[PDB]
Homo-oligomer: A and B are copies of this chain.
Amino acid sequence: LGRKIYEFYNAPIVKFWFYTLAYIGYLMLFNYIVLVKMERWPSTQEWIVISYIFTLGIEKMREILMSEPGKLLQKVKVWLQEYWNVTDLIAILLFSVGMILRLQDQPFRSDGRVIYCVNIIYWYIRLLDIFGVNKYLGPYVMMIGKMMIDMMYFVII
């Protein structure tokens, strides 16, 4: 039975729905805390939001360290070869400057909350990468990419 629970959780199909219930949970709790009032210290629901990113950050660092190249300068460029992966880290960095500003008093506290509002507009278009697992969202998300090179690209004329 211990082998059954071990082999069930280690499957990549099982790990998909096991983390995307946590991802849609991070989306809805972050929607909750922006609606809840701000104070000098974060509440219980805000404290689980911040720790969700900090545990994600160590997870991103093990992607660099446990990578295929061996040389340290080599395992920087190949990790930034993905268009989704490069814009992931700037949103984590925007969350971090948003945390320091929110921990300080007003008017810095309203400024840090504003940087949270450009975080939540990012995490929905982050999900599009997770969308392409299905038979219809494979093509549908990919044509958002080519319409992206048509919709800020119409705008010249």
CB <8 Å contact, A128 and B157:
yes
Number of copies: 4
Q: Using Cβ atoms and an 8 Å threshold, which residues of chain B touch A22? A: none
Residue A56 at the chain B interface, CB threshold 8 Å: no
Residue A137 at the chain B interface, CB threshold 8 Å: yes
Main secondary structure of the interface of A (DSSP, over half): helix
Q: Give chain B nearest CB distance to A154 CB in angstroms.
A: 9
Q: Using Cβ atoms and an 8 Å threshold, which residues of chain B touch A128? A: 157
Tell me which of B140, B153, B156 contacts A157 (CB under 8 A): B140
Interface size class of A (residues with CB under 8 A): under 10
Give the nearest-CB partner of A144 in chain B.
B157
Tell me which of B136, B141, B157 contacts A137 (CB under 8 A): B157
Instruction: In the A-B complex, list the 5 residue pairs whose CB atoms are closest, starting with the nearest.
Output: A131-B157, A140-B157, A137-B157, A128-B157, A131-B156
Given contacts A136-B153, A140-B157, 6 further A-B contacts (CB under 8 A): A128-B157, A131-B156, A131-B157, A137-B156, A137-B157, A141-B157
In the complex, chain A residues 123-153 whose Cβ is within 8 Å of any chain B Cβ: 128, 131, 136-137, 140-141, 153
Q: Using Cβ atoms and an 8 Å threshold, which residues of chain B touch A131? A: 156-157
In the complex, chain A residues 54-100 whose Cβ is within 8 Å of any chain B Cβ: none
8 sample A-B contacts, Cβ–Cβ < 8 Å, listed by A number: A128-B157, A131-B156, A131-B157, A136-B153, A137-B156, A137-B157, A140-B157, A141-B157
Q: Using Cβ atoms and an 8 Å threshold, which residues of chain B touch A137? A: 156-157
Q: Give chain B nearest CB distance to A20 CB in angstroms.
A: 12
